[PDB]
Design a protein around this ligand. Structure first.
Ligand SMILES: */C=C\C(=O)N(Cc1ccc(Cl)cc1)c1ccc(O[C@@H]2CC[C@@H](N)C2)cc1
Length: 151
């Protein structure tokens, strides 16, 4: 239902993970909303990775649990001043992209059925901590897309 509920947000986090992993699904392709988010979130992830080269080469992400704990430290720090904006929501997807790259390279017991887990808790955080703001600011089609679509 609607674009601020779990299903829509899970589909966005899923698409972003398939983009980072280089495994887009075959079948009509992603939505306009997803295509704009992928382009802008990836540009941010590239910057975050450069800006944290030492910090990222220190932690090891061997499991879904460890990735959730690391994502929790990030979200707490990112929103420690209490303010929500589109740039910070874009930053959530950039961090899920970095976490799935480290999990693919460091998951002690690999499992291709664990990218869906990361997407799940990312959508869980977005809906429970930013879902009200998103809907009150136009949602994804009249909020996110209008602000970040090509001019
Ligand atoms: C450098 C390790 C550290 O303290 N972490 C843990 C960490 C490392 C790698 C990933 Cl990916 C996820 C978590 C850490 C690093 C950055 C954090 O923050 C971000 C930078 C500022 C804020 N906007 C997000 C939080 C924790």
């Amino acid at each position: 239902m609607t674009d601020c509920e779990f299903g829509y947000i899970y589909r966005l986090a899923q698409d972003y993970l398939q983009c980072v992993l280089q495994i887009p699904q075959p079948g009509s392709g992603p939505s306009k909303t997803s295509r704009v988010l992928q382009n802008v979130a990836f540009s941010v992830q590239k910057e975050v990775e450069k800006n944290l080269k030492s910090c990222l080469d220190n932690v090891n992400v061997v499991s879904v649990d460890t990735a959730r704990t690391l994502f929790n430290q990030v979200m707490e720090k990112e929103f420690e001043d209490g303010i929500i904006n589109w740039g910070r929501i874009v930053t959530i997807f950039a961090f899920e992209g970095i976490l799935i790259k480290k999990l693919l390279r460091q998951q002690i017991a690999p499992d291709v059925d664990t990218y869906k887990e990361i997407s799940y808790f990312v959508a869980e955080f977005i809906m429970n901590n930013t879902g009200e703001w998103i809907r009150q600011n136009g949602g994804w089609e009249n909020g996110f897309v209008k602000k970040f679509e090509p001019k």
